[PDB]
Amino acid sequence: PFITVGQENSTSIDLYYEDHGTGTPVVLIHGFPLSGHSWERQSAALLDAGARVITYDRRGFGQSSQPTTGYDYDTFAADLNTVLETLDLQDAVLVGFSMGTGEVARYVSSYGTARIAAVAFLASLEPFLLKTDDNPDGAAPQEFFDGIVAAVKADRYAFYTGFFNDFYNLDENLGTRISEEAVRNSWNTAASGGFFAAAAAPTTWYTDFRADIPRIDVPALILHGTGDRTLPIENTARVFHKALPSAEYVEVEGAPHGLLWTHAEEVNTALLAFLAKAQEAQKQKLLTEVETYVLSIIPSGPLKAEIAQRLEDVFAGKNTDLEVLMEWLKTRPILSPLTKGILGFVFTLTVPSERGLQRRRFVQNALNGNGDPNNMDKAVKLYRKLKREITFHGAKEISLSYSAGALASCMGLIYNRMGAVTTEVAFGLVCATCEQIADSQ
Amino acid sequence: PFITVGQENSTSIDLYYEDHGTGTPVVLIHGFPLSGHSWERQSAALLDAGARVITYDRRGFGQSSQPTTGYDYDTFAADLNTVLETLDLQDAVLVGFSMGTGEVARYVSSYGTARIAAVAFLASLEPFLLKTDDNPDGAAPQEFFDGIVAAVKADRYAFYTGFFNDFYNLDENLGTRISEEAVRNSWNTAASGGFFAAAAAPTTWYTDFRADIPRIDVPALILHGTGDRTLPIENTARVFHKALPSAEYVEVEGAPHGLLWTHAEEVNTALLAFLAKAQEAQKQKLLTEVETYVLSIIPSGPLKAEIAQRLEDVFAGKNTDLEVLMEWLKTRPILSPLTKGILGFVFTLTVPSERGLQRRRFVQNALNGNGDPNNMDKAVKLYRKLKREITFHGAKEISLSYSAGALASCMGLIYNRMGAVTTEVAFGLVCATCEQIADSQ
Amino acid sequence: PFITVGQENSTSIDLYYEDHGTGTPVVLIHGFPLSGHSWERQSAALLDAGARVITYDRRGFGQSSQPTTGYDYDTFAADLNTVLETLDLQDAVLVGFSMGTGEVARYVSSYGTARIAAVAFLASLEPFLLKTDDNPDGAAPQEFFDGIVAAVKADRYAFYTGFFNDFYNLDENLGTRISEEAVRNSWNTAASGGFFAAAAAPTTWYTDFRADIPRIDVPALILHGTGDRTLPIENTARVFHKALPSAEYVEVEGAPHGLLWTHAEEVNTALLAFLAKAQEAQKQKLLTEVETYVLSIIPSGPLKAEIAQRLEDVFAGKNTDLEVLMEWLKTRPILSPLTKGILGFVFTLTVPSERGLQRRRFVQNALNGNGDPNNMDKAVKLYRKLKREITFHGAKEISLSYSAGALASCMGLIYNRMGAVTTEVAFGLVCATCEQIADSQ
DSSP states (O other), X not given: OEEEEEEETTEEEEEEEEEESSSEEEEEEOXXXXXXXXXXXXHHHHHHHTEEEEEEOOTTSTTSXXXXXXXXXXXXXXXXXXXXXXXXXXXXXXXXXXXXXXXXXXXXXXXXXXXXXXXXXXSOOOSOOBOOSSOTXXXXXXXXXXXXXXXXXXXXXXXXXXXXXXXXXXXXXXXXTBXXXXXXXXXXXXXXXXXXXXXXXXXXXXXXXXXXXXXXXXXXXXXXXXXXXXXXXXXXXXXXXXXXXXXXXXXXXXXOTTHHHHTHHHHHHHHHHHHHHHHHHHHHHHHHXXXXXXXXXXXXXXXXXXXXXXXXXXHHTOOOOHHHHHHHHHTOSSSOHHHHHHHHHHHHHHSSOOTTOOOOHHHHHHTSGGGOXXXXXXXXXXXXXXXXXXXXXXXXXXXXXXXXXXXXXXXXXXXXXXXXXXXXXXXXXXXXXXXXXXXXX | OEEEEEEETTEEEEEEEEEESSSEEEEEEOOTTOOGGGGHHHHHHHHHHTEEEEEEOOTTSTTSOOOSSOOSHHHHHHHHHHHHHHTTOOSEEEXXXXXXXXXXXXXXXXXXXXXXXXXXXXXXXXXOOBOOSSOTTOSBOHHHHHHHHHHHHHOHHHHHHHHHHHHHTHHHHBTTTBOHHHHHHHHHHHHHSOHHHHHHSGGGTTOOOTTTGGGOOSOEEEEEETTOSSSOGGGTHHHHXXXXXXXXXXXXXXXXXXXXXXXXXXXXXXXXXXXXXXXXXXXXXXXXXXXXXXXXXXXXXXXXXXXXXXHHHHHHTOOXXXXXXXXXXXXXXXXXXXXXXHHHHHHHHHSSOOTTOOOOHHHHHHTSGGGOHHHHHHHHHHHHHHHHOOSHHHHHHHHTTSOHHHHHHHHHHHHTTSSOOOHHHHHHHHHHXXXXXXXXX | OEEEEEEETTEEEEEEEEEESSSEEEEEEOOTTOOGGGGHHHHHHHHHHTEEEEEEOOTTSTTSOOOSSOOSXXXXXXXXXXXXXXXXXXXXXXXXXXXXXHHHHHHHXXXXXXXXXXXXXXXXXXXXXXXXXXXXXXXXXXXXXXXHHHHHHHOHHHHHHHHHHHHHTHHHHBTTTBOHHHHHHHHHHHHHSOHHHHHHSGGXXXXXXXXXXXXXXXXXXXXXXXXXXXXXXXXXXXXXXHHOTTSEEEEETTOOTTHHHHTHHHHHHHHHHHHHHHHHHHXXXXXXXXXXXXXXXXXXXXXXXXXXXXXXXXXXXOOOOHHHHHHHHHTOSSSOHHHHHHHHHHHHHHSSOOTTOOOOHHHHHHTSGGGOHHHHHHHHHHHHHHHHOOSHHHHHHHHTTSOHHHHHHHHHHHHTTSSOOOHHHHHHHHHHHHHHHHTTO
16 A cells, blocks of 8 residues: 655655554654564554554655655655645554654654654654764764765665664574564565665764754653664663653663564563553543533533532543433433433443443433434434544534534434444534534523 | 315315314214214214214215205215325224215215225115115105105205204203204204205105115114104114114114214214224234234244234233343344344334333344444435324335335334334334345245 | 414314404404404404404314314414414504413513514403412312313303303393394304314413513503403403503403403503504604604704704604795705705605695705616616515615615605605605715715
8 A cells, every 4th residue: 555745757756554453543663774564563562452553664665666865854754744644643643763763753843743642762863863062972973874875885785684783683682582584584674675765864864853852742752772782872762861851761671773573572561551541641631521511511500510520430430330320310300301311321331331231211212303304314424424433523523514403313323323433433423412502502 | 174076167066074183084974954063072072082083064065065966875975985085094984974874885885895994874864765665664755755855945944943853852852962052053054055955965865775785894883763753763774784784783762863962972982882893803903914924034933833922912902021021032042133123123012011111222233224324314214204104004015115224224213212103104114124024035 | 364374184274364454463362262253343443543453263263274183372372473474464463352362472472572562461361360379369270160171062052152141241231232143143153163172272271371471572451341250350450460560451340251342442442542552652663763864964063953853843743834844944054955855755754744735846856866767767666666565674674775866766756656655664765865875974
């Protein structure tokens, strides 16, 4: 699969990409000189955990086209952006490795964190690799980088072998953490890449990311191996943590540059944890937004305080007997039967275990749309559109273009299991209904 | 309200008619020289009982047009037919009084009992009023009828007074069973009627109905007053019961011709009873037809015999715990989940009391149409059409023009109380589904 | 003539109605068990006075259809509403008698006084006839009303006689204020009504109108007879006047329930007076609005104060010599000839008596549209549209879509009696002109 990002003379520039699983989107951006297929161990972990894993090949690498232009980070980001906007990804996590970490930063800096929930920096370039006067903490001088460019142009094929030695720490790890076969794979990958790209890539490594680090809006993770020979931890990750103290910081003990493969376990555990905390903060933001819309229709009174208390109770993870809750809702005075049903709907949905209870009569009658064929015809039409959506906001927006009778009917449709949508979309629906009823008062 | 039956020169012939209540249709056909409004006491009883009461004014009477043609029973029936076919009445009961009884017979004879469930003959003309050689049991000779025609033409207004005296037995009943005011009403009614009709009507009274009585296909009721002065019981009802022994026969003791008003109680009790027996035989024919379609999808085996036994049990009126029944259905082996749900649907519907039980999960899932928006879009469309229908056959026929997925979805729609139709229509639906599934096997 | 209000099985529900005279619309709503034709004496008075009299037959009475549903006041009002919206009546007066007074209230309560100028309550049900604990002032207990329903169902025909005795106070008034023949008429009327309606009607009489009385927005009249046997004045009108002190209140001395016929004189005098005061308050609201538009074109000065003073003088009802007035206008300095003519136009129109004066040269020349065929072609077109309008606002709105030359020409057209429109529409025209000239300054 491909996405077109630009043009070169008579050919189009196309980036190879992969899209797997279902759930919260996670974008993995590989390092030099490998491809999206280098993440394989991480991907595998991310799929079993329940995340949407997107991987792609940076221009001039893997199975992407091999142009001879735009080998800089303002372009690489413009690439990534195109990817993000093509797939209309929302609430996404960016994960970059080696070279990938550059995209993350520069993207975040230039284009903003509207779509981005979180970021992760594994074996980072940051802040600024070049050793000058105004950057004393730099890793190497300008002459060292010019030397690598010369080394590749001479013979990239031979160069790879020697690069991968320092990359993986093969004098330590060969036969132990990485197999001879795994190294052979990585070599073929590098070899399949574009000749110009191979030589043009090292020049981008000493890009100045200092003006970009203060833009980093969202929760971040920095990760690095202490035995990293390619990117010295002392000149990158540690000084990167000084510039961004907010970030969560993890040092993996005795790990090389190629810590994705060798130390997959320690990488995954840390990664998933960081994703689990950012996924229980994007679930509590959905839940609390849901709560505000749900409370917008209830009349001010001591009843609104018990209702809110219970919502927060079931939202935080306190297993409450749905049977008692429903029976409590049913018998409430003042509340309109429309209101109780919405609440009813919400609770059954958000309660952790339904315990094998049946659907309530009072809810069914509340959410039936008065038995009007037109409302139900529109509910079916809306339902069709809600299958295609994946976000809360994307669901709520299309839901607001219908009438209050059709929305209720659509809810009841879902309540009655006559259809099925994802949890977040459903919230959008009910919230859209809560806004349509709250705007007529 | 009016129905057009024919044409006279430049004007159309229109019959006044009334349509009240809801349920099994009952047609009331008045006697000479009154209108549909004479039935008022019977109507009142029929509405509280839960029947659809249709009344109309025979040509030349009440508020119907007043032509000078077609004053014979081949026309009066053609009138009635038009009424029946205009309203597309099904499973109807015809009830005739005095002159009305003639229509009933002649209609039944000529046009057949396709639409007719039952008939009733109150104060009947039958079989043949004219006293000749080949009809010795006749009530009066040809000279007696020619004398009435002369009496009306001379002065119909004055004639009515004297007619109503013998009609109601006023020397017995005035101030007692009928009020002076009620008689005054009946007179105004006769007076509002057409002058030609008044004179032309008595000539039809000696119509020969003997060739018509053997055609009477359906269950019948004959009723007459023993003190009937206008139509002697000895020359009508009693000899009518000899020609049709099958009929249910009731003699009201000491009742006049106008026994509708005077003896309303005895008339209603008898009438409703006769309607109640013919309404518990048109409910058992619906139930047993329903049973045959329901059993058409089940695999032959010892399970089909228990299922049938229970259907017959709940169809006959034996209150069976729906909870036990459902739990029995749910746990059955061999039966397809589609089958159980249909059965589930049927039972909840036909069981006398639901006892406040909720809707079953297993049924809901069975009848959801797989959560396919198209099936449900069609179910809504069918549902709309099923609101308009009133019969089992009218429902089943339109249901058979849709797919098996949409029918199931429509059922589930009704099961979930997201809509509502009459009981008989619903049967049509489920039966239509039972035929669509039984034809794919 | 008929208006369709709903549906019963295969027949439409149609209300009989009458529309007579020309002018300000007045709606008369009859009492039980009579029809629109009971108002005859009032109507006659209202036509000679110069009012538009609309009368109709409530469902189940008179010549209206005779269904067996919707016998409640939420339906009776929905009926009345339909009538009002069908005829697009504006600035209407509702007058209800006995049962009619219920419609008035409930209509006013539910649907608002957008169309209604005023109301009148003759022999009122209000506020609440039923005697309970929370209504001690009630007229009778629940058992008394159940007794009437039983009395009718038994024999409505006989019941009417006894009802009309108490209705009219026949032991007092027979041969004196009402004739034996007039009573016979009322009986026939009741007798022609629907049998179900007759019995269903008394159940509506104890409707709770207390929540409806505070809604009564407009000027009201309450009227009742002190010798009223059917509706005791002490339990209705007097306690009704406590709940609505704003109302104008009139007690007719020694009058029965049927005070429409018996005491026609005292009813009419009071009624017309109330209509005359409410027609000189909806004429002063038109007049003062007219005044504001007329004064919008005049230059501020001592001349604007004399002009306004005269307008108010002729608007209040002080007969001023039009000859002197015109001669005063003509000779005024500062005023534009266009302005004088408008004023001229207004005065001749609003002055009570023209005294047989001719049309003024100076006005004719002012309002001729410069003798331009195009302005006059448009004036004719506007004139055509002004014939169809009946309101001030409806007239002014269509007038504002033309040019200032055409409006003047149209005015002159009307001034010259080359056409004719109603008074209020004319005001709209001139006011529309006054706004077109005032917006160019």
